[PDB]
Design a protein around this nucleic acid. Sequence first.
RNA 1: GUAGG
Lengths: 72, 77, 48, 233, 226, 435, 242
Amino acid sequence: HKRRLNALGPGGLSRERAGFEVRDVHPSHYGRMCPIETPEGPNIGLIGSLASYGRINPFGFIETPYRKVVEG
Amino acid sequence: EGIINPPIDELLEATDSKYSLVIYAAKRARQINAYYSQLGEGLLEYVGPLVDTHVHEKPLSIALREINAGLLTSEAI
Amino acid sequence: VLEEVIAEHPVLLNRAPTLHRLGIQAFEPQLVEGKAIQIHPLVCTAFN
Amino acid sequence: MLIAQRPSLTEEVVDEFRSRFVIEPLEPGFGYTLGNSLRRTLLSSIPGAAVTSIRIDGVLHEFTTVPGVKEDVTDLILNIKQLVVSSEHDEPVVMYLRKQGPGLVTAADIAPPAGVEVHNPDLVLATLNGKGKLEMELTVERGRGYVSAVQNKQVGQEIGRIPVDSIYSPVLKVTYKVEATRVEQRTDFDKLIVDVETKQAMRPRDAMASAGKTLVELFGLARELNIDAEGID
Amino acid sequence: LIAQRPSLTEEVVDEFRSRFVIEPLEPGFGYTLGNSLRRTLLSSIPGAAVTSIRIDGVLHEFTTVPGVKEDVTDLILNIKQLVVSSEHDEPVVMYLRKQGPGLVTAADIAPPAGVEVHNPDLVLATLNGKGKLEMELTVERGRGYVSAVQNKQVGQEIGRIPVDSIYSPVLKVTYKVEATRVEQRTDFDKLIVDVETKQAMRPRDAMASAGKTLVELFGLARELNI
Amino acid sequence: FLEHDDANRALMGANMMRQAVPLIKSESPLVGTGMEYRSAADAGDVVKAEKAGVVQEVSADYITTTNDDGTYITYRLAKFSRSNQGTSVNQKVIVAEGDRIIEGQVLADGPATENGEMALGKNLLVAFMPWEGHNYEDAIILSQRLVQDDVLSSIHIEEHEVDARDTKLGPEEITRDIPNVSEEVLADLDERGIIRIGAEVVAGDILVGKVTPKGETELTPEERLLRAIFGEKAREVRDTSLKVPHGEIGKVIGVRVFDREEGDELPPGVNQLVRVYVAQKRKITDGDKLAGRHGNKGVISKINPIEDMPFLEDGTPVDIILNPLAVPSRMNPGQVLEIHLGWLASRGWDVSGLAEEWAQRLQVIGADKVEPGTNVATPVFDGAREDELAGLLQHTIPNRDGERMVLPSGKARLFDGRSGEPFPEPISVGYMYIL
Amino acid sequence: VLGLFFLTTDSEGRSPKGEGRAFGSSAEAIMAFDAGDLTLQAKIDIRFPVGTIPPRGFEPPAREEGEPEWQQGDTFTLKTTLGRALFNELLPEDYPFVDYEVGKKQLSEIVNDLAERYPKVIVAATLDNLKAAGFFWATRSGVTVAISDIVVPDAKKEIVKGYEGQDEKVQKQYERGLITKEERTQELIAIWTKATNEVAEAMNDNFPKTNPVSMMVNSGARGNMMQMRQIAGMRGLVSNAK
RNA sequence: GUAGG
């Protein structure tokens, strides 16, 4: 409950404003939002848990760590 | 000793309809039930259960049993 | 007294979506301990 | 401690050979032990007697055809094992058969020897075309339960002789079912219904009496360890 | 054809585990006999157990006593599996008392005459120096498992609390069948039953009890006909 | 074993772990990823130390510790406090008296925890086989040993309150003197009119006795005659006492009272408030839902006796039975793998100098020697392969009489319980975590 | 339906011990089965007492005799399995014999026939007998799921690595710009569709009919072969977003 | 509002 991110709220994507595109997963939700757990009810894909290693940017974006690889 | 105790097919053939049967059995059951609720005023128009009766029972089962035995009859006005 | 009185009296079981007319079906009741209805497997697929 | 209500076996008869038997309410979880043990013991423990080998005149074991009879050997084996006998010699005995002319040899045409009897004579055995030519000789011996037909080298002794499946059990089948019942507001009671289909040789109740005595002995064997009491009725 | 009556022999593998052999059984007969013996040896055996208790300064099983590091429900769970042997038909009373730092154990229980506890090493709880525990126990006899709710017979005594109890001493019984060395087509089977039971009683006694029940019930099946 | 499961079934499984309820006693998973410890410690429910000291006195109500600096800290463990959803929040104590402490170490469990490791359920023995139609269309069959040992049992606390509001006609009174009731119903009530602590209640009982100030009464002629004949007085005050709700049972554990004229402040108008707790111990019974971690869920359908369960060769019964028809259709093969590994965790494995590929992998990883009962960790995507499971099954430690009860295929021979004869072919058996 | 199919199944469903014998009647068959020599799946000769209507297609054939014989209503011997005899005993006596697999379609067909040609109470009674017998024999079947029950085909790795080699060659020839990206994607679709179809065929050939999954998918109980394909074979092409 | 169907 603490970590969940909700797209529903004031000045945002409401229940009836939902579409096919927003709900589905995106190639960018990798290490920033787990694609598996979401409510399986009508509000499918409008709620999502934060990734395991996720972190917040001061602006409000989500970052993820990556190990640095050099010369193979 | 069950809801399906009288097989339906015999009832259907005598009645000729799946709806005429229910209306006719229900009218007979109403008459029997009101007779059992007479409590002694003894109206002559009412009649008792033709077939023997248990100490506890529902009038509709007795009605359907009479239909299967065929002792009753119906006549549309 | 309850076990005596329920018999030869049909009760209509029904499921919520009730897509087609097999959604509501009559049964002859029967007492049983616990707090969960018991239903006949064969008719289960008709209700979905 | 004591069981609330004692059971009481009783009998319902639908036919002179088929019968059904009900045990009045019994402790929860006790129906299945009784049902399965009774089925097994009735099916095997009860003794009896039946044929063990048959011999056809002028026929080889590989030669399945028998001259003078429209019927084959396979149906003949079926018919003879279908027949019932009653013997008490406790050793092999030989029964004979020699009939000629056309017609139908049945189980009323048998001539058992002393101490061996065929309870029912009404089985039709063989229909003959032309000359009967029928001559058979078989062996009878008491046994227990069921024994499948197995070679015993008698074919080398006499080519005509072959084993036949033997049914020493005087009963044919037993089917037991346990169903719940409600007593004193409580539904945790079970009634055992045993359906015994035996042949006309023995009455089913006598067979069950013998079975019950066998089980009583076999489980009273356990009492030798020590003496203990359990609440009953 | 061959007639051979059952004959029993016994053997001990541990103190409270044992193996019993019945050799001459019929074909397809060892399994059924073993299953019947197992079912009756697990279902119905007399035994003794605690059925209700009473803590001083407690009104319900949910609270926590001072001095213990386990609440009352934990103590119920710890006492439930306590095994007791009782000879009195009527209920009997035990009392537990402990003070100071240590660990209360079944060995500490005060035994009335004719009632015994068979697992002294079992630890019930533990106490610190400031702690104090005082308790009453009602011990009864029966067979099987009875829930606390059926046991409860006294609304008025708020302090008394019922506990579910499991009287039967048996743990587990398993049977195996073999093929007789005799040269017969029937291939008779030798039944061998391994029984292991709680510390209450010797298995031999339990099997004898099982035999009593079975022979009584089979005789009931038999006598009424003919 | 998440990689094996489908997407939908892992979705359902994750959605279900949030709905588990804590039990009377918790036990950590024998098979499960190695991260549960962190997800337990970081959660607030556990009670972890904040100094690296030594414990002096341990008691259920409170644990007292002292640091080397000299600060004495005593932590209060919550007992049976109602949670938001209505479940107990009991906390147990782990640390012994003389044990040392490093900062941050867990000192007490929360709900659904054991040694600081998450535990939402219990690990049962399970076999896959249809059984008389009592597990038809996802249903579940399990022994009565669960009901007998309180393996699956949960406390539940209901809180209900009443307010001695004041109205236009006058003030309400909470009191023992209730009108137009028998004397017996007012048996557990205190003189103040509040039920006692520990007095069991049932549907229709009386908890706190409140009476309305007055209602405008215009008595009917029949009531007047009955009263005159019986010589009773229909007094203006009316009973409006709180009763236990229908279908609710329990034993009262706690009652709290707030009063206006006392220092405590209440909303305007109300003179007194009384809240009462009723706490019961619900055991697993027919109709209760049950589910595992891989999206396999069903309602209990029958609790058969202990003997009727098909018992393995040594005599151990199987605690739960699951339909196999679900597994290929629902595409969640992982549950099957887990079961075998679960068995492997119950009886330990010994592998030294075997020199096979999986043997070498286990030796380098360090998971070569294990004793029975020790847990195992298979991270979500670094989990064990099938060759390792097969090799371990081939080399399980002997449990009794120097034999392995499970075949190398992973199945075992099950004797029937009711009939008594062995089943035709071996069946798959092992341990599974159930919530 | 799994139980019924396990009942009226052709041989090889197990090792057919003691096949080919002739038995006096069904009763002796069950006694032999209890003895353990016979198997529920084994072609044997069975007699039937009077009153047993013979198979629908058996009406033309009959026994051999010089006198008129009406086998529509009297004794006759057939070659069948014991389980077929039990299954026919479940159905009403007036109903002719059946000597084929029931599965899911044929069972629906005979149920439709019963519902058409019989009163209702009889239909309900036979449905209940079928329920009880099916549950019991499904219990007896012993179907399960375990690690070794689902085995990947051995040929999978070779064929898939060959197709990987071909794909690598096409990627190499794309790296030189000889083929456009859109065209490269188009041919990769074709080749991998071929590869997944081929592995599906190989998996279908591998699995016997006694495997627990094959039993519960073939019988019509529950399941479809694509789910099996992606359980034991490579899942293959997956649609991207949008 | 959020869960289960």
